[PDB]
Amino acid sequence: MKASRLYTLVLVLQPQRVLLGMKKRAGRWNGFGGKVQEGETIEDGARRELQEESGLTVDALHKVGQIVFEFVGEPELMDVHVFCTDSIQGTPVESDEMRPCWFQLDQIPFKDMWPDDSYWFPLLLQKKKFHGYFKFQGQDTILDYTLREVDTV
């Protein structure tokens, strides 16, 4: 089994809208996140990446899922820990890396999101917790995947 590298993903989910970020350099909407750094907890890495990529500062995040990504031709798995909060207290800010944008929950921009999001994002919206795994050939094609609802992440 391949080694895996720790990443975070953060979804700001309010009752009628969700915050996504357009990857500027790319072209898909995503939650905010990045690699976990040495010595920080996964949740603290998620808070840090939310601040760096979206400008939002939050004190706490709720873990809602974990997704492992395998890319054909790449040696490592991406082990993505997915977090969610409903509670913010500042405005998102656009950088040269991510442009944050709100979407109503009947307008989730799946056509411009990664293909795996079609499977797990509905579980997140239902307040279900999940474990997923997706194998990709390139950016567009899923060759294999698993997804399970769990009671504990």
Interacting residue ranges for Na ion, rule: CB under 5 A: 34, 110, 113-114, 116-117
Shortest Å distance, C-beta 75 to Na ion: 20
8 is in an annotated binding site: yes
45 is in an annotated binding site: no
- CA–CA separation, 72 vs 75, rounded Å? 8
52 is in an annotated binding site: yes
DSSP assignment of 25-92 equals ----EE-B--BPPTTS-HHHHHHHHHHHHH----S--EEEEEEEEEETT-SSEEEEEEEEES---S--
Beta pairing class for 4-13 and 77-85: parallel
Shortest Å distance, C-beta 37 to Na ion: 12
Residue 79 vs 117, nearer CB to Na ion: 117
The answer to whether 83 and 61 have CB atoms below 8 angstroms apart is yes
Residue 85 vs 132, nearer CB to Na ion: 132
Residue among 54, 57, 49 nearest 82 (CA)? 49
Please list, in sequence order, all residues whose beta carbon lies within 8 angstroms of the beta carbon of residue 101, skipping any fewer than 6 positions away: 19, 20, 21, 22, 29
Residue 68 vs 88, nearer CB to Na ion: 68
Shortest Å distance, C-beta 53 to Na ion: 6
34 is in an annotated binding site: yes
Shortest Å distance, C-beta 98 to Na ion: 7
Binding residues for O(6)-methyl-dGMP: 8, 23, 30, 114-117
Binding residues for 2-oxo-dATP: 8, 30, 32-35, 114-117
Binding residues for Mg(2+): 33, 49, 52-53, 97
